Structures are given as C-alpha cells and as structure tokens.
Amino acid sequence: QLFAEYREWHRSPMGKYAAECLPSLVSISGMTAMHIKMSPMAYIAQAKL
Amino acid sequence: SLAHVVDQAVIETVQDTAYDTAYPAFFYVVEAMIHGFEEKFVMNVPLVSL
C-alpha cells in the first residue's frame, strides 16, 4: 500500500551504493552522476562531454 | 566496507583507563548498587554524574 520496489524511481542498487559511501565531495559527485538518464539523447549529451 | 567511528585517541583513553592504578574503587560500590537495573540508574544518576 505504501511502496512497490519495481514501480519506483530509485531502485535497490542505488540505495546499495549510498549505504556504503565514505561521505565526502567524491561521494556527492558520484551520487549526482548516478541520477543521469539512460536514454539516446542523454547519450548525445554524454558524448559531447 | 565498514568505516570506523572511533579514532586512535579514544582507544588510547580507554587503554589508559585499563592500566590505571588509582582507579577510584568507590565506583565499584556504585556499580554494586546499580547491578544492571534501569530504574535504579534513573534513581542514582546525580551521583554517576559527579
């Protein structure tokens, strides 16, 4: 009634990384770079940089 | 992948407490009166504070 794991934006492995961080600016940038969409035009935007 | 929360200084502190010769024995009497009961610790907290 409150949560369904498959019908969710943030799956379990993304929590698995975040549990085992060693909190610093490196982990902040890692978690920021994990939110990147996995898409064709997102691949274009990745391929530019 | 664990990160330790205790640094080396506080372990040095606890080690120093272990090797204390002049550890105050009156504390044991307190511990003897406490003997692991919650309510009696709540009773005797202004002594363990001092």
Side-chain angles (χ1 to χ4, degrees), chain A residues 15-33:
Chain A
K16 178 65 170 63
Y17 179 75
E20 293 185 353
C21 291
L22 292 175
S24 294
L25 299 174
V26 286
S27 294
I28 295 296
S29 299
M31 286 298 291
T32 305

Side-chain angles (χ1 to χ4, degrees), chain B residues 23-50:
Chain B
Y23 186 76
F26 180 76
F27 295 164
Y28 296 113
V29 177
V30 183
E31 190 177 5
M33 289 304 180
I34 291 300
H35 60 85
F37 281 174
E38 168 69 27
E39 185 179 4
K40 298 175 72 171
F41 182 77
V42 180
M43 289 175 70
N44 290 319
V45 66
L47 189 138
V48 300
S49 67
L50 186 60

Side-chain angles (χ1 to χ4, degrees), chain B residues 1-22:
Chain B
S1 298
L2 186 58
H4 291 88
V5 192
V6 145
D7 296 333
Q8 203 268 333
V10 42
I11 284 170
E12 286 184 352
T13 301
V14 175
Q15 180 184 2
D16 290 331
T17 64
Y19 291 156
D20 194 4
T21 305

